[PDB]
Write a protein that binds this DNA or RNA. Sequence first.
RNA 1: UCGGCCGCUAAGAUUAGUAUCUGUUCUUAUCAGUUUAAUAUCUGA
Lengths: 101, 83, 878, 64, 254, 38, 117
Amino acid sequence: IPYWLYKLHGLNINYNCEICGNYTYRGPKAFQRHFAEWRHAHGMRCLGIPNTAHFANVTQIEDAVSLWAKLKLQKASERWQPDTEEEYEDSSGNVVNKKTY
Amino acid sequence: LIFCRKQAGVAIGRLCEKCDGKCVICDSYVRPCTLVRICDECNYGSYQGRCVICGGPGVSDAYYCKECTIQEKDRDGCPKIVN
Amino acid sequence: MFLYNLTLQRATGISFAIHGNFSGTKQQEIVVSRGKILELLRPDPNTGKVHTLLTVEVFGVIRSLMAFRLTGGTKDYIVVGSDSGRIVILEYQPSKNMFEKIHQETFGKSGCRRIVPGQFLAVDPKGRAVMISAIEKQKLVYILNRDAAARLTISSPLEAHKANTLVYHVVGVDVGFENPMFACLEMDYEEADNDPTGEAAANTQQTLTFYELDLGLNHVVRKYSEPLEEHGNFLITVPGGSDGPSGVLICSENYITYKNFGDQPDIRCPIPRRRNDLDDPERGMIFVCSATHKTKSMFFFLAQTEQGDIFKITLETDEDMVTEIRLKYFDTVPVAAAMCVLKTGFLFVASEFGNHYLYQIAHLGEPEFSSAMPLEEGDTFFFQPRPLKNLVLVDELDSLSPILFCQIADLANEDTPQLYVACGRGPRSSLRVLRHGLEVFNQVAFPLQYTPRKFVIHPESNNLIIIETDHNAYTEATKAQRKQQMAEEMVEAELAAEMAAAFLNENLPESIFGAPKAGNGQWASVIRVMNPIQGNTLDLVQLEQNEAAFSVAVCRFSNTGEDWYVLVGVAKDLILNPRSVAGGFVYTYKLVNNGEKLEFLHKTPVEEVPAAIAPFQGRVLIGVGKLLRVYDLGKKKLLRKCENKHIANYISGIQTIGHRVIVSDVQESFIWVRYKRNENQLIIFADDTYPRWVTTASLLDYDTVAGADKFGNICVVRLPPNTNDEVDEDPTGNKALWDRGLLNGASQKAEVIMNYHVGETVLSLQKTTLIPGGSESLVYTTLSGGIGILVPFTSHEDHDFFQHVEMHLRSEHPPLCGRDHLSFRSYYFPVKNVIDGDLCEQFNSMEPNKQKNVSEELDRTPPEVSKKLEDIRTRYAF
Amino acid sequence: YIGTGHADTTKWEWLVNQHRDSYCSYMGHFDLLNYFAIAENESKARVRFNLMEKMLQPCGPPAD
Amino acid sequence: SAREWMRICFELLELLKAHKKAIRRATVNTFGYIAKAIGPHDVLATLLNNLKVQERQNRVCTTVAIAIVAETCSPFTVLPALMNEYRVPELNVQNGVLKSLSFLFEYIGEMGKDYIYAVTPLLEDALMDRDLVHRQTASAVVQHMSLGVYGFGCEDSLNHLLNYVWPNVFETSPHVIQAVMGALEGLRVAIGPCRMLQYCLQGLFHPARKVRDVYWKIYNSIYIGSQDALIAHYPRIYNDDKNTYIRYELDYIL
Amino acid sequence: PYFMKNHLGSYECKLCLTLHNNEGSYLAHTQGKKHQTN
Amino acid sequence: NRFTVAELKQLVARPDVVEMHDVTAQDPKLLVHLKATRNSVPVPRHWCFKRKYLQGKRGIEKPPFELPDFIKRTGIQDYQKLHDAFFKWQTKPKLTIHGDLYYEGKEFDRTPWGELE
RNA sequence: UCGGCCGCUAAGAUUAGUAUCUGUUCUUAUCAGUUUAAUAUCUGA
Ligand SMILES: [Zn+2]
Ligand SMILES: [Zn+2]
Ligand SMILES: [Zn+2]
Ligand SMILES: [Zn+2]
Ligand SMILES: [Zn+2]
């Protein structure tokens, strides 16, 4: 391949993903596409994290875990939790949850 | 090309024969609307009753077209082209 | 859908009022700007009744108004500063009864812009020049003269721009026949924008600056500038040229100061404060408006404070200079937008809100305070407010400004509905009942204690339940406690005891003297049950200090049966700016004794202001901040049964139809929510594609919502067909991670089908028939006291005719203050599907030759055009 | 024209322009001013004077 | 006679080669006078065939003439034939059709509202075209269409076309980018400053100076055009540590 | 074979994806390096 | 002094909009906030593509433009039929929503109120 | 992933801009600076 094309495609630059067991992707185009490819997906399955657009451009393992921790708490704080959040009355106006009811 | 853009006064802009009908902003022959006002400095002396566009002898009044009026391009300043 | 807008009752609020001989005769008239309407008033000097001679819609925002008379002139002209980037001079033609536009000079773009002039307008006292200014940077001076035909002429504008400079106020200075001068209160912001310590901002001084217009050299020079000790809020032109000393008074917080260019020392007098005032001790005082009365012999100014007290201000001059400023308390009237002294001995007070008053000046004006009297640090002048003495009330012009809430209903059993109108403001608030009829609408007013926010009609008794709330206000219990401690501090600091006992017995009515301003974040609120027939209070609940009621609903709960409950949503310790709140409460009352008495049940705490409460399916929806909760009744509390947490900002209103809930956001407009009964879920299924600052909403049909916004617009949003509202939440909660929706909101979008800018803020919208056997209209009421309708065309033929009439009138009869009509109606969004019948009815007011020209274009005759215009008016609303 | 920006406009400059335009718009639109006078329970004149006073440093001091 | 005017039409087609603009301008008007006399059918057929020429002076004057014929005789008589000529696989013909539409929507003004939905699919084709001139001329149509139908509820078609005009804001070719900016100024009036601001927001603080330069030139034109309207439309920016960015008065409730 | 006329009336190579004003431009292209490599 | 993409995604309410080049902005917090705003429209994807905006559309034998059905049934491919085409038979085309930008590869009681009688 | 380098448009006027083929496209050890969104480019070690 001519050297001008190697530099245009940025194959000179080398990018690492730890979710891929330190697999190096040459060029930005190859690296920005892998986050949807198989190797990254498999690495995210191993961590137990769904491979969403949230975790694109996230290469380190410790960051992907902490971001997944943040997201899971965010979505749980978004959603209606009728098992703990619904209010019931037993007798004489004592406020209780659905389990206690 | 560069328009004077100075605060326009009471003086009315003129067009020569060849530029008659043209909007001074967009160079359209279509739908004259608002009458053109020019600044005092573009009107004073030998520049009295000269064409807003080219600078030849004025014969008719300059107008902004309806499109320039809707866009409020008539509010931008003295539209005499000085270059 | 195509609507036609008509005004039923024009805005009654007054923004500006000027005085002069507009007819040319010795009779004095008053030109008043309601915001979008210019109106000529003539008080009869014999009767003391104000007659409206002319009202015109100017389809713009009037931002300033001044009267000028050329030297040796006999007729006053009107100069208008507006939101069109044009200065307009008008002359009233008494024979034709119309305002003729004499001159219209264009200088900039339209809108209420920061740097394009229009906000401030000043005229040289001898009529030789007018200055129009922006809040920032730009000032233009137009030379005014007359030609050989004695017709007014206007020059090209001379500019007087300075970068980075804010203008607080401008007046012409009465210099006699010397070169015209304009005094400005200015502040340079340049050093503030460049200092990250914030120290320059704190050390920035307001300056008084005098721009002189050299008539010889044809340029404006900034001749003198001087910093001020404290920031002035406005200037008063002082009489000059041998009818006074010239110079200006600067009104600032706590002080009135006289300054003149030259060797005049500055003279400063403290503003006198009410003795034993219950207002928060920290607050100072500003004059809100001034009037000058120049008799040939003498001059005085009347200036009103923000508590409504008018002071007569006289300048004592010795050989063309001033030595002292003297202040005498004159009378207390409601806080005025404008006060105007008519030479016939009458004073017209255009209230800031509510009814306007014409008083007769019985006596021309107790201790006389003065700038020459010594005063120590902390010490001030003290006067005692007392009932009217120098003024006699002769006429009272009714105004609905501000309309805060409205219900159109037949509560009186008249078959024709009445309009129940919650009018502001403060202790001058009222519930007004409006009937179509002659005594266009006749009113009856019932007083209220605080600004009414909302009311609801109890279905079984037709009693109103009104919540009234004011910020900066004491409850009755707090005001009593404050009065007892002030009487105790009076004695502590035998004669004092007699003064304390007098003070506790002195009860100055709040409707007249104003309510005591408590501080920031202090609220007073009441829940009032009122009979709408004669407006007697059946029940009044005073809430605790610093609880502010913002929402109210009357409803039955399914679990409890037939009993009616009232729910009031209250905020606890709300600070408006910066916004913070200490939670809130929903109070629940049972409404008993045939809807007369409120019996307290319980108070349920909530985390945010419960700003909207809507009965829903035998339970209630409550919007608590940005959370939409379903609540059921319970025994000790309302019980939370369902929640949606996906609403963007803050819930300003909720409307329910079937299982759809339309939620108003404060800024992100309309969100459609489906309630699933079986799943017990609230799911957002659709939203809008524009920010709207929603004030009010009305459902027109099952898919269509009409909304109004803070900015004066009305919109109608509709769900497109095959909008599916049956969408469910993922039980696992995995789809929430994948689905991102559309444009960072709901996957389905509503379509805006109508946009129109009314020009005034609309706080109520209701779909109703106004006249029996008539057709349904969307009625709206504005905060300027204006009532309008939007009515649908039924025919293409009729829509096409009025569209053509509007097209011709937009060109043939363009708005008086130089604005483009289509631009003004498209102020925030492009107008869409509304014809303005306020413009189309100006056809009747046109000159007959212009009526003939337009009608020929329409291929009709002027009587036939007028008939069509009347036919649509009468179908929907008289 | 004051309030235009360019590729180096910062958050603070953009927001100070918006706040200054907003306060001038409120001073210009009568009903918007009415709404704030009623909400705050202040005179319209007091409201206007308070807006004029915020025009100097609406967003707090510059970053640098 | 009908044949006499048709012979004149052929002679007028040659007078579009004239050096003086006053002749060409007078020739263009005469084509509309004959169209009013005879009918637009056969005079337009003559004009559409004169779009196959190589001279740019002669072919632009035909596009003016076609639009005059569509102004004299209502555009519904002219448009079906102009839409068909767009199907001809030639560059100057397809550019000629677009150029005729540009002048057509500029001449008819408010009558545009009846012909927006018809032309919209044709303008999408052109805006999707690789050719820069197809995109440049269709942007001029959108500009004149937009200003013509302002106040007549045709935002749905114009916002649709904004989706095909907006990706050309990164074009560097001066006449192309000037046509795009002119389209955007037109759509600011017709669809509103709120919409245009919504297209700007993401690019104002974008990392590349390629995206900010452009987005600020657009935003500045909206700002200067609509300064007061934007007050309602600015997005909420949250307070930072040092600075207060919330407009709290707009959050007050009554 | 790879010679096609576009909807604009110009000519394209399908193999190389190169635009040609005329037939002569395409025939010079077929002699060229880009076409021979493809 | 720049955030990492990892560090910015922790600090923002919408980690998914965050892109690789966003950390190189002069204000990444404001940028991601504006990218998360309701009804804001993404920058055209080709701002960083080497090839110009539509230049990559080549080697396609796209068919001649299909006229709308109401113009097609006129028989242009009668002046009252030509009037009925635009004023009777004219149907609104399939339009696209706010913010749906075109890119190179994209192509390939229930009674209403205020209705006319 | 296809840049960089050496016929058409403006109702132009009676000159300004811009697509497209051809040909050429620098192998780098390891880092740094200048730069840019990134890369490249340029300059050192
Ligand atoms: Zn990976
Ligand atoms: Zn000039
Ligand atoms: Zn023009
Ligand atoms: Zn000329
Ligand atoms: Zn090839």
